[PDB]
Amino acid sequence: QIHDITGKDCQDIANKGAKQSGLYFIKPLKANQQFLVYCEIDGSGNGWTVFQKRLDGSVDFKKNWIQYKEGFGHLSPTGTTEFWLGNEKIHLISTQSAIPYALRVELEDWNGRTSTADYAMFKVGPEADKYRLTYAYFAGGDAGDAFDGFDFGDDPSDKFFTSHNGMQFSTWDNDNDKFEGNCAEQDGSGWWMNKCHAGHLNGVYYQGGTYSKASTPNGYDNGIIWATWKTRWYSMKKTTMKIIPFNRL
């Protein structure tokens, strides 16, 4: 169920001998109390700390500010459950000791194809700054750089409106986006919204992937999307968001 070795993150845990993916206790520099996390440990001693997982539509991602801050969903020793670790925990891990962390977004198709997109020097700010997302540069990956924004063709400033670097976090009850309306409320989720999005992994789980403007009454593109890999009308089968110290790349 839960393993004995502990550390500051899953890489530290892997550096101490553990070789099995599963549940572990970690305690980041500023964390006053230890908490449970799911570590993904591969054959090369890489230990990834997973903070978000989607795979079957068992959890509703339309949660409020406090829920996204504290975390929701279920942690499993088998890694077959959906959850959001919690913004406060993501903040404590990503900013401890100025250690440079890399974020890996892993996506899976309804056709079996998996893709990734890596971001160097990933960080999540404190609550005072509404858990802002910042990264140095896109490090590569076949899923493409959706965080850089995308020109959908709706408005000439589309790219400026869809980038995510520097965006604060938003939930329906705590709007901090760059939109006149409420992106989080219209979509029904919690995310780093701009004048909405180009990459949005906390959207509605549409079975089969393909959906349309007709699926929803207002026709919102509120699925689990990553514009640089698939159309805004295609919802992902599985997603994984995980972090590891930059030097492990």
Alpha helix stretches (DSSP H) within the chain: 10-15, 65-70, 87-95, 158-162, 183-187
| CA 189 and chain centroid, separation | 12
Percent of the chain as helix, strand, coil, to the nearest 5: 15, 30, 55
Tokens, residue 153: 């063709």
Tokens, residue 113: 């194809």
| Residue 179 near Ca ion by CB under 5 A | yes
User: What's the DSSP call for residue 114?
Assistant: E
Q: Is 61 annotated as a binding residue?
A: no
Q: Is 181 annotated as a binding residue?
A: yes
Q: Looking at 170-235, which runs of residues are DSSP E strands?
A: 199-200, 225-226
Residues 6+ apart with CB under 8 A from 112: none
Q: Is 125 annotated as a binding residue?
A: no
Q: Is 177 annotated as a binding residue?
A: yes
Q: Which is nearer to Ca ion, 177 or 187 (CB)?
A: 177
What minimum distance in Å lies between the beta carbon of 167 and Ca ion?
12
| Residue 175 near Ca ion by CB under 5 A | yes
| Residue 177 near Ca ion by CB under 5 A | yes
Binding characters for Ca ion, 124-163, by CB under 5 A (x = yes) = ----------------------------------------
What minimum distance in Å lies between the beta carbon of 246 and Ca ion?
33
Q: Which is nearer to Ca ion, 133 or 241 (CB)?
A: 133
Residues in the annotated binding site: 175, 177, 179, 181
Q: Which residues are annotated as a binding site for Ca(2+)?
A: 175, 177, 179, 181
- The site for Ca ion (CB under 5 A) is made up of 175, 177, 179
